């Protein structure tokens, strides 16, 4: 009754639905806590990440850096494969993928540069060939430059700069953090206070309005205690903006319009600690002495409830939900609550290979100085136990185990982890994604299915900027691990393969293993 190709198409349709039923983040990070890790040696074929190459800082940048009179700073434009260095009032960009790069110098600025960022342009403003806007903040003003990052035959963007006549006086508030939205909105913050500013700009000059303006969205007044920002974070999928303060206060702002920004949540460390105390498992790794060192937004495509990850200096990952009071009038949330905690692993890095309760006391990630999360959960933590050498903890969801876990009530935040050692003197500065953002589906269910996209998009790669160079870290897929493991079985017995294969079956299941 039903011919071959139609029968096989039925199998495809049911297989597509099976891959798109991969558990969403909310489902395996339910209220509670977890310490589930399988640690892998960095030199193992089972390593979830590994360093593929490194790019030294050009010698000319070292000449300028050591010629610094007062202030210097480094940063990453990982989206286009560029890095930058500021020396006092001078800025230098370069393509770090190029073996002998030329330095793009920009020295028009009159005062010390305090922040630099590469953001999308405002639509309908610039010629289509302008791909980005370069924001340069000094102690006196903020400067906008047009950017065209067109790809070259070699695979590294060609960068040319355009003047704009767009600039505004800074004012009294320091600018150390610049972030941009998908639509080209530019937000500013710094180390003077917790105020958030926005830069507006338009093509036409008017007699009653300049081409470029600046406004303070915080509208402060009266008595104000000392407090400033540690970072700004954007989530376009929810039209939200987050700030982290030096007191570990998390503020949430909603973009109710193309020119509006409204503060809708303010959650201090005490509130986080109160939520934590109401959880079943309390821990000495999170107290009133603990600092939150970084935030990472979680987009709505990845999870409905969990909006935000917060990293403590003890290495705890705090996952916070946010909820609106109502269901209709984007809808702004009005509450934020600490729901789930991923506690640190226990295994420390070792030169020699060393040999079920919730582990809520590990110090392996203490102190955590910098932290980053990328969908579907790739986690980088800069652990600074010693003041000269950084250790990099890198982990990923155990996609294979999460996909096979049954029933749904048994789902936990299983992870594969590893330690990547940086040489003595390497101080990590920034980590950015070099490939396209990960997404296996368009909604939380199916979103995190790494297995499904092994052959549709290249493995994620991450540029780790240090004070000596840029290191490229690459995510390894099942097929990469399987191929590497088999490569070690080439010189062994019939039973040597069967043993290695059984490791894969016990983690990924038989079908996924045979498919690899």
């Amino acid at each position: 009754a039903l011919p071959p190709v139609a029968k096989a198409a039925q199998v495809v349709n049911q297989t597509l639905q099976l891959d798109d039923s991969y558990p969403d983040l909310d489902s395996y990070c339910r209220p509670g806590a977890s310490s589930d890790y399988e640690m892998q040696s960095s030199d193992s074929s089972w390593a979830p990440f590994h360093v593929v190459r490194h790019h030294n800082i050009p010698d000319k940048v070292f000449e300028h850096l050591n010629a610094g009179e007062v202030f210097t700073k480094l940063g990453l434009f990982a989206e286009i494969g560029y890095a930058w260095a500021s020396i006092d009032s001078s800025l230098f960009l370069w393509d770090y993928t190029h073996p002998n790069p030329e330095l793009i110098g920009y020295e028009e600025a009159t005062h010390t540069i305090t922040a630099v960022a590469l953001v999308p342009p405002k639509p309908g403003v610039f010629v289509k060939t302008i791909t980005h806007v370069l924001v340069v903040a000094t102690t006196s003003e903020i400067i906008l430059l047009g950017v065209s990052a067109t790809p070259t035959p070699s695979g590294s963007k060609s960068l040319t700069l355009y003047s704009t006549r767009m600039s505004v006086h800074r004012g009294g508030s320091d600018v150390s953090f610049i972030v941009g939205t998908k639509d080209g909105r530019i937000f500013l913050g710094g180390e003077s206070d917790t105020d958030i500013h926005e830069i507006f700009y338009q093509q036409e000059e008017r007699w009653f309005s300049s081409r470029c303006g600046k406004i303070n969205h915080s509208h402060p007044f009266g008595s104000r205690q000392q407090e400033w920002l540690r970072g700004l974070y954007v989530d376009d999928t929810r039209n939200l903006l987050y700030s982290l303060s030096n007191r570990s206060t998390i503020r949430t702002y909603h973009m109710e319009g193309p020119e509006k920004l409204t503060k809708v949540i303010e959650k201090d460390k005490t509130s986080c600690l109160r939520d934590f105390a109401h959880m079943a498992d309390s821990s000495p790794l999170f107290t009133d002495k603990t600092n939150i060192v970084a935030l990472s937004p979680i987009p709505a495509t990845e999870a409905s409830k969990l909006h935000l990850m917060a990293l403590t200096d003890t290495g705890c990952r705090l996952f916070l939900s946010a909820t609106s009071s109502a269901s209709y009038t984007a809808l702004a949330p009005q509450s934020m609550q600490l729901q789930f905690v991923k506690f640190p692993p226990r295994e420390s890095p070792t030169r020699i290979r060393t040999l079920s309760q919730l582990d809520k006391t590990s110090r392996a990630l203490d102190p955590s100085a910098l932290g980053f999360r990328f969908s579907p959960g790739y986690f980088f933590d800069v652990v600074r136990k010693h003041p000269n050498q950084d250790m990099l903890f890198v982990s990923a969801p155990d996609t294979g185990r999460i996909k096979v876990t049954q029933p749904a009530s048994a789902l936990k935040y299983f992870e594969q982890g590893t330690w990547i050692e940086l040489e003595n003197g390497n101080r990590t500065i920034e980590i950015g994604l070099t490939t396209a953002p990960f997404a296996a589906a368009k909604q939380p269910l199916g979103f995190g299915n790494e297995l499904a996209v092994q052959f549709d998009q290249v493995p994620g790669e991450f540029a780790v900027l240090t004070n000596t160079g840029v290191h490229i870290v690459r995510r390894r897929r099942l097929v990469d691990i399987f191929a590497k493991a088999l490569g070690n079985c080439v010189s062994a017995s019939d039973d040597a393969l069967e043993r290695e294969v059984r490791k894969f079956i016990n983690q990924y299941g038989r079908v996924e293993t045979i498919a690899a």
Binding site: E102, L103, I104, G105, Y106, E107, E108, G124, V125, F126, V127, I130, L145, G146, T160, L161, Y162, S163, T164, R165, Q203
Partner: peptide, 14 residues
Amino acid sequence: RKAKLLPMEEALLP
């Protein structure tokens, strides 16, 4: 080498 800054005329339309 100081980067050549092409003019605003090309940059913004129309």
